[PDB]
Amino acid sequence: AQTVPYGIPLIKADKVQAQGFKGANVKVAVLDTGIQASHPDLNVVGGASFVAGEAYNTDGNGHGTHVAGTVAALDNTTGVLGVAPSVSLYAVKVLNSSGSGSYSGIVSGIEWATTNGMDVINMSLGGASGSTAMKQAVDNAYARGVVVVAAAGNSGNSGSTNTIGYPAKYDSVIAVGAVDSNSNRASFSSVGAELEVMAPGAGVYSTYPTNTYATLNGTXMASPHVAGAAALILSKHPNLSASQVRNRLSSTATYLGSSFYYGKGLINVEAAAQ
Ligand SMILES: [Ca+2]
Numbered sequence: 001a002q003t004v005p006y007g008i009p010l011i012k013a014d015k016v017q018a019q020g021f022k023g024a025n026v027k028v029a030v031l032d033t034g035i036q037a038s039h040p041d042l043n044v045v046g047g048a049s050f051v052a053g054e055a056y057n058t059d060g061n062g063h064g065t066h067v068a069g070t071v072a073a074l075d076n077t078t079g080v081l082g083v084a085p086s087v088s089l090y091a092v093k094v095l096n097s098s099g100s101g102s103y104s105g106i107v108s109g110i111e112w113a114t115t116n117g118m119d120v121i122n123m124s125l126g127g128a129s130g131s132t133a134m135k136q137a138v139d140n141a142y143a144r145g146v147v148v149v150a151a152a153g154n155s156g157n158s159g160s161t162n163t164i165g166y167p168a169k170y171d172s173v174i175a176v177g178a179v180d181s182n183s184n185r186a187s188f189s190s191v192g193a194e195l196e197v198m199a200p201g202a203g204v205y206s207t208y209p210t211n212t213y214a215t216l217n218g219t220x221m222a223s224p225h226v227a228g229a230a231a232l233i234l235s236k237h238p239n240l241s242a243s244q245v246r247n248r249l250s251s252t253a254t255y256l257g258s259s260f261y262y263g264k265g266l267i268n269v270e271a272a273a274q
């Protein structure tokens with residue numbers, strides 16, 4: 001029997017999936033530690049590794065397989081259900097088993113995904129600094145029509161300190177914060193002027209290496225929900241631009257409070273797909 005995580009109904013993705021739009025023919029690339037491709041509730045159609053020694057179809061850490069399950073775990077009678085269970089899923093391995101990569105590795109992942117025509121890029125990762133080539137790669141991606149989503153960061157609120165990290169801090173990247181099952185800001189969610197929307201990030205249940213399932217906490221769990229919401233909108237309205245997908249998501253968000261803490265608010269993909 002399949003479990004539906006609380007996140008899928010809280011962002012109303014089940015409402016859109018019942019209308020018949022499940023993400024078919026949208027290509028989503030997960031830039032992360034890889035994906036365990038043999039996992040029975042995941043279908044990975046391809047990908048690339050910029051980690052020497054490792055292929056994309058292995059996840060030595062866990063983080064990548066979890067983030068992918070939240071975007072695309074298959075709608076069946078097994079494990080969990082993703083936000084866009086019919087997308088074409090691509091694994092781009094830019095982080096190692098330890099969950100560390102260099103800026104160049106990440107940049108070659110972004111570049112590979114823009115060049116292989118992904119509709120949506122998810123980066124559940126954040127550095128303390130940017131990089132000129134990283135700014136150019138996401139600006140490039142977004143100018144080519146790719147929706148670019150990343151985790152705002154898990155640095156919490158500190159007075160009026162802007163704690164949003166990179167690539168989220170760039171203007172061509174949707175910075176995603178974290179709420180819990182009661183729609184409260186998760187204490188670790190970064191704050192700052194660039195925070196755009198919030199999604200489920202506390203206690204998220206999803207696929208995990210080796211044919212199992214796990215609960216993790218992070219804006220890194222919040223981000224795949226928005227990458228999945230974009231995929232649903234695009235399988236329903238397939239000639240929209242990336243700024244049109246981006247604009248449906250923040251203009252229809254449910255207001256939760258001050259933008260420093262919440263951005264435009266909690267996404268509602270039913271309202272955004274209308
Ligand atoms: Ca399933």
Ligand SMILES: [Ca+2]
Nearest residue numbers: 168170173175
């Ligand atoms: Ca941004």
